[PDB]
Amino acid sequence: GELWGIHLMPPRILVECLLPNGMIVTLECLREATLITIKHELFKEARKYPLHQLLQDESSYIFVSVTQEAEREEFFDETRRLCDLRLFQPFLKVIEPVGNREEKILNREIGFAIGMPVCEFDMVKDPEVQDFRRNILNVCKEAVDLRDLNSPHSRAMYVYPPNVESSPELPKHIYNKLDKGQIIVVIWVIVSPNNDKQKYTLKINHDCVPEQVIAEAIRKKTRSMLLSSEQLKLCVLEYQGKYILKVCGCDEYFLEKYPLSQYKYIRSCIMLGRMPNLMLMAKESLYSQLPMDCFTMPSYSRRSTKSLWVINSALRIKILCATYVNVNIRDIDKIYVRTGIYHGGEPLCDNVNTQRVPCSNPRWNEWLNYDIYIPDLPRAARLCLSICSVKAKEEHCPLAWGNINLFDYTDTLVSGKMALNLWPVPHGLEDLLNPIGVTGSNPNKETPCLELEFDWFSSVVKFPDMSVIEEHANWSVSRLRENDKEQLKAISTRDPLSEITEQEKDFLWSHRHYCVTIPEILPKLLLSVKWNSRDEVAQMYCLVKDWPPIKPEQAMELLDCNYPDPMVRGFAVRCLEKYLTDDKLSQYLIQLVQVLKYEQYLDNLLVRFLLKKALTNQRIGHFFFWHLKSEMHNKTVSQRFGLLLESYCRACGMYLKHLNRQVEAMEKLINLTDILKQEKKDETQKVQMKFLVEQMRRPDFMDALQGFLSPLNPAHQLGNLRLEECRIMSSAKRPLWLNWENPDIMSELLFQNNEIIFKNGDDLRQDMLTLQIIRIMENIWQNQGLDLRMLPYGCLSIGDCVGLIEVVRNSHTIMQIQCKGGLKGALQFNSHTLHQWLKDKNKGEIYDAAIDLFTRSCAGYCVATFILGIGDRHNSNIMVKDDGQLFHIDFGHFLDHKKRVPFVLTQDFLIVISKGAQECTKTREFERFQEMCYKAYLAIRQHANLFINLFSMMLGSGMPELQSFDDIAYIRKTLALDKTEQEALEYFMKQMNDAHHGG
Amino acid sequence: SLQDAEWYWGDISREEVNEKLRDTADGTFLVRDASTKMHGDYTLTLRKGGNNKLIKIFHRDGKYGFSDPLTFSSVVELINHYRNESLAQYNPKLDVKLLYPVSKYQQDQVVKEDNIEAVGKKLHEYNTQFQEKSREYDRLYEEYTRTSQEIQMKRTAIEAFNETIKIFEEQCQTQERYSKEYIEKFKREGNEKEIQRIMHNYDKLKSRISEIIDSRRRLEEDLKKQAAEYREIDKRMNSIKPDLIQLRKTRDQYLMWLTQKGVRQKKLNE
Numbered sequence A: 001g002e003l004w005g006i007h008l009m010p011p012r013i014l015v016e017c018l019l020p021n022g023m024i025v026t027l028e029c030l031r032e033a034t035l036i037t038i039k040h041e042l043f044k045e046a047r048k049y050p051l052h053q054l055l056q057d058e059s060s061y062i063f064v065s066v067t068q069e070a071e072r073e074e075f076f077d078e079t080r081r082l083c084d085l086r087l088f089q090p091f092l093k094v095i096e097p098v099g100n101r102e103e104k105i106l107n108r109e110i111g112f113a114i115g116m117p118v119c120e121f122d123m124v125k126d127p128e129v130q131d132f133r134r135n136i137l138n139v140c141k142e143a144v145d146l147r148d149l150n151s152p153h154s155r156a157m158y159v160y161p162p163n164v165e166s167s168p169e170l171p172k173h174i175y176n177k178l179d180k181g182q183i184i185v186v187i188w189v190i191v192s193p194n195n196d197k198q199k200y201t202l203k204i205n206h207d208c209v210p211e212q213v214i215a216e217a218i219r220k221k222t223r224s225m226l227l228s229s230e231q232l233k234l235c236v237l238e239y240q241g242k243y244i245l246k247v248c249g250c251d252e253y254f255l256e257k258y259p260l261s262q263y264k265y266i267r268s269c270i271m272l273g274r275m276p277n278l279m280l281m282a283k284e285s286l287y288s289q290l291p292m293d294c295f296t297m298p299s300y301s302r303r304s305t306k307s308l309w310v311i312n313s314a315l316r317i318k319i320l321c322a323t324y325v326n327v328n329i330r331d332i333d334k335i336y337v338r339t340g341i342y343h344g345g346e347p348l349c350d351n352v353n354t355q356r357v358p359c360s361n362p363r364w365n366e367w368l369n370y371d372i373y374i375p376d377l378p379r380a381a382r383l384c385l386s387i388c389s390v391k392a393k394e395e396h397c398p399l400a401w402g403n404i405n406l407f408d409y410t411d412t413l414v415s416g417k418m419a420l421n422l423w424p425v426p427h428g429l430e431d432l433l434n435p436i437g438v439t440g441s442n443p444n445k446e447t448p449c450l451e452l453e454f455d456w457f458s459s460v461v462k463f464p465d466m467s468v469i470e471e472h473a474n475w476s477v478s479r480l481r482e483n484d485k486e487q488l489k490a491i492s493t494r495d496p497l498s499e500i501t502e503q504e505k506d507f508l509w510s511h512r513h514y515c516v517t518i519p520e521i522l523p524k525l526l527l528s529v530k531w532n533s534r535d536e537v538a539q540m541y542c543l544v545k546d547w548p549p550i551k552p553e554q555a556m557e558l559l560d561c562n563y564p565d566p567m568v569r570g571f572a573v574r575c576l577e578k579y580l581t582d583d584k585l586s587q588y589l590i591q592l593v594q595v596l597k598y599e600q601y602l603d604n605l606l607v608r609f610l611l612k613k614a615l616t617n618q619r620i621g622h623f624f625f626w627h628l629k630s631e632m633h634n635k636t637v638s639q640r641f642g643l644l645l646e647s648y649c650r651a652c653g654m655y656l657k658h659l660n661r662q663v664e665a666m667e668k669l670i671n672l673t674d675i676l677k678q679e680k681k682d683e684t685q686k687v688q689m690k691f692l693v694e695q696m697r698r699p700d701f702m703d704a705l706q707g708f709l710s711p712l713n714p715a716h717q718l719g720n721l722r723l724e725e726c727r728i729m730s731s732a733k734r735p736l737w738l739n740w741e742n743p744d745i746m747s748e749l750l751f752q753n754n755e756i757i758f759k760n761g762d763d764l765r766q767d768m769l770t771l772q773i774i775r776i777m778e779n780i781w782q783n784q785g786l787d788l789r790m791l792p793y794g795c796l797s798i799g800d801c802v803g804l805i806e807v808v809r810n811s812h813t814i815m816q817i818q819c820k821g822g823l824k825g826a827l828q829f830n831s832h833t834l835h836q837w838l839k840d841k842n843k844g845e846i847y848d849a850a851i852d853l854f855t856r857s858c859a860g861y862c863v864a865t866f867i868l869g870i871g872d873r874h875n876s877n878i879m880v881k882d883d884g885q886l887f888h889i890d891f892g893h894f895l896d897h898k899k900r901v902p903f904v905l906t907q908d909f910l911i912v913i914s915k916g917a918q919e920c921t922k923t924r925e926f927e928r929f930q931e932m933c934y935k936a937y938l939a940i941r942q943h944a945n946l947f948i949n950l951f952s953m954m955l956g957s958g959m960p961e962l963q964s965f966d967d968i969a970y971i972r973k974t975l976a977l978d979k980t981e982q983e984a985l986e987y988f989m990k991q992m993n994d995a996h997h998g999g
Numbered sequence B: 001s002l003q004d005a006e007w008y009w010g011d012i013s014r015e016e017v018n019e020k021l022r023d024t025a026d027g028t029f030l031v032r033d034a035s036t037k038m039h040g041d042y043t044l045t046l047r048k049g050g051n052n053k054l055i056k057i058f059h060r061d062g063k064y065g066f067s068d069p070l071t072f073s074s075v076v077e078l079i080n081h082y083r084n085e086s087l088a089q090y091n092p093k094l095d096v097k098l099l100y101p102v103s104k105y106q107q108d109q110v111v112k113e114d115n116i117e118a119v120g121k122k123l124h125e126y127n128t129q130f131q132e133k134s135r136e137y138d139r140l141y142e143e144y145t146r147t148s149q150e151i152q153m154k155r156t157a158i159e160a161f162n163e164t165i166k167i168f169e170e171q172c173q174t175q176e177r178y179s180k181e182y183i184e185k186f187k188r189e190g191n192e193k194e195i196q197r198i199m200h201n202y203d204k205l206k207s208r209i210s211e212i213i214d215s216r217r218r219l220e221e222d223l224k225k226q227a228a229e230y231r232e233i234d235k236r237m238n239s240i241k242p243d244l245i246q247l248r249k250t251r252d253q254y255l256m257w258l259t260q261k262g263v264r265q266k267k268l269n270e
């Protein structure tokens, strides 16, 4: 709200103005009054108060006030309205301005973007935080220098990067829809001040580059001009260098020389058999809407020890006492703190506990001794601990937890007294320790605080430099085969979570030198290393230093929580930054962001890689921002992501201006829904609707919600609202159904209106992960040649249980379609009603295409939902377009409700698949339908490693569906990865014939 | 016989055995028929170093073992040999003996007459007691997180009151700095009129500072009281957790009497 506890300011309010002299002046001012108007009328009114003789000229002052974020903000940007300041109370203090104005104005804009004030970072004591802020600014200048290099083109390649598939090589079923290897494409040209445009239809090779398209168009128009070969060249040269191509209806551009069929828009136009509509556009016009945007270094940017391997002693730690522990003294017997030394998820040594202690006096003062030699500590070692209660049988429970890095970001071993506040234990966790949790102290006040002391060895202790580590390997190494070859390869085939016994892992460690001939084995070999042996670790470091690059789908496993060593993770990053395309990065960005939570320190190779890419490609930068911004509420990562967001916003250039327009749009919508969720929940639907339309008709709302980019896809501009069609929805949490006009000059060639759902109250990150995973399966099937059409509609979480969802035009639930039909049996709907409605919307020759689309899409979702355990869906959770394309919705709703059928294949579907036949399960349409399902099932099983890694990387999300690897084991059952293909195939057939029940 | 042995549980999942060696002492052990679901192939898992270390039991010519040189006649001979002596002569870095087993029925804690009502009545009772207490635990965790966020909203609000009061106090200290000797001048010029203009505005300054100071303590009061009711919701959950865990296991293992027959009829009534 514009004031604390107030949604909107009245049209006129009183503002307490504090002058540089101790006079206080009440100024009545409009809600919309700009500070320039406030300051001029204040000093105009001040002449009515004492001691005006001491006031300097109006221009020598600015306003400072307190915002609802508790920030004393200097209002250097005097052009803002009184109501946009986010004031806590309506007052203004007059001061003389100090410091760089441009910096202060820019920091405020960053604060609005990331949702927290930047000055909160200036106060942080931690040196790791201040070093991070200064030490990644070079990654920012690397990116800005690079994209400003070949201006303006390099700048356009950042804002409008080519949207292309990862490989130009078409699969046969796509190539077969080309007319003898060619594609027909239409070029449009706005040609009138009124805007009247024209079109030119072309037939060209699918692999022509954009400049060649422009050559065929100008060649087709100069057909009758009687040009010589060289004269034709010059005007081809004129137009190749003067114009570029744009997709009609959205802001996608063809700026580099990928073959035309590799641009996704056109790869799909072939796949879908639709006409590619392009617009020839002047380059000087595109570069005009790319205003120059600089990057300035901020103020903060500019202004003996012995080795671990000499310490001859075992590890010990003193656990002193606790504070603020909340426990019922008469229900709980005693408390004790549990500790363990971990490397990832594997204890480096056995756990040890304090003595049990009365709940009324949490004090131990015990030195816990650990069975590990200090030199044997790996760099990525972590102390994991919790405070546990005990209550006949004896059973324990954790009360709060906390993890600690035995080495800090400077490679030094911790020493001296330490005190950290513990975190709440997550819902449904019974394990006494939480190693996958973040390392750090809980900033929330009045929380259980635990105190420790680490041994002090007369001086600072540092981890050995890589110099001596390699020599220790040369020291220990001094202290082909056939049948063994086939087993090593036989182990690389097994999934990341396959059971790996002792004989197999030390067998890998024995043949660790032969493993570089099958680099896919590296994850298995790393889990085989005995990490509590500095001999093996040193020997292992030398192997990964020379390891052959593995491809990204395998390297991503080495960023999950089971591979915390910086050398290992560094090898994984280098794999990505040399083999991971911007296409596949943009897809896997959800996982790649949230493995940052496993990073031991703020400054690491992974964040520098993602940040570098986000600043050089504004498409992945857009979602890079929102996936971080969506987690700001979470205090376990609010700081890490906050600092990371600060850097991005400080260097993303002019796009920050657009992002803030989105943030403001969502901040307005989340406010209206919050009002409807509590202030008006107690009132009728029609009453809520009348408040909505009134509230949306207000000008300030329309000015904030009209004319901005869609967070689901910034290539979609959102113009005027169709208030005619926006509404609340029947759902209990009452989301908003919103409709914008597409302002594109040629919007009619893609869509004239853009419809989106905004839901405030529901956790959407499950639907994100599921819809993402579905898109991966669709891309796998398409690459293989299975033309199974899925509908991974757009869905984006932007914060705590709030986000956006793409509306699929011309779509209905199977429940709605059943209600369009009638009853056949006693109170029974007609099973043929689905098939009938399809024939209604698809008449004549186009009928077969709709049936094929239904059968293919249905086959896809049957395989997908089964594998992921999303079997039983309500008939209102399944949907189908007039097109005949079938898809599912509300995945989180399904997981949230599940707290018998493998997949929904009701008679209604079976009818349309068999085109309305009797005993439909015995026709040749059904015969080749289940053949599609079988091929699609084992097609995913072939890629089971990728999916298991993607879910493994989400464990730190805090999604209750992903708390431990045991949650991921379900996909090993559905894919039957502990069985061979023909066994897995028979398993899936058996399951479908339970969905059909065998009759 | 192996089929009747304490430590052979059969086709248990890796997750179900991981749930059973949780936090156990070095030397606890348990064996399965391998997850690969192939006849006559078995895996040993025991606790050592806070880890569940799996070992494959190879089988050839009716003999048994877990290394290439294969010897033993039965798995019971293989296991009891290492219940006696240390296994360190094989895979020597680990050395703990096969100390403590966990078994499939040595905890069938049904007290009295083994009527089937011990399932059809006492199981439905515990499961009812379990879902009720699980519903309360979920309700607690809901208002627990609600109260948690309403607290930090108040902590930042009072922290904002701190900055507004800091800014009004400096206003009073500058009001006395720049008005002191203008008062002293109006004092001897006999201009009580202007002196009362200045004082009338000063009183208004420190009149409003008292309103926001009061607004702060009135909010600090709501924080003190909601912060305490938050601590109560915490210790209540911590009291419900070990209970919820206890009668969950009881509900779980009262399916033993159901698994004894091994058909769903006696739960199918529910």
Ligand SMILES: CNC(=O)c1cnc(Nc2ccccc2C)c(NC(=O)c2cc(F)cc(Br)c2)c1
Pocket (backbone or CB within 6 Å): A765, A766, A767, A769, A770, A773, A868, A869, A870, A871, A895, A898, A951, A959, A961, A962, A967, A968, A969, A970, A971
């Ligand atoms: C009736 N259903 C079950 O019984 C069931 C049992 N185990 C499961 N484990 C599992 C497997 C693969 C990926 C993730 C998980 C948690 C699932 N799957 C999910 O919950 C799920 C699926 C998604 F696609 C996305 C998200 Br988020 C969650 C279901």
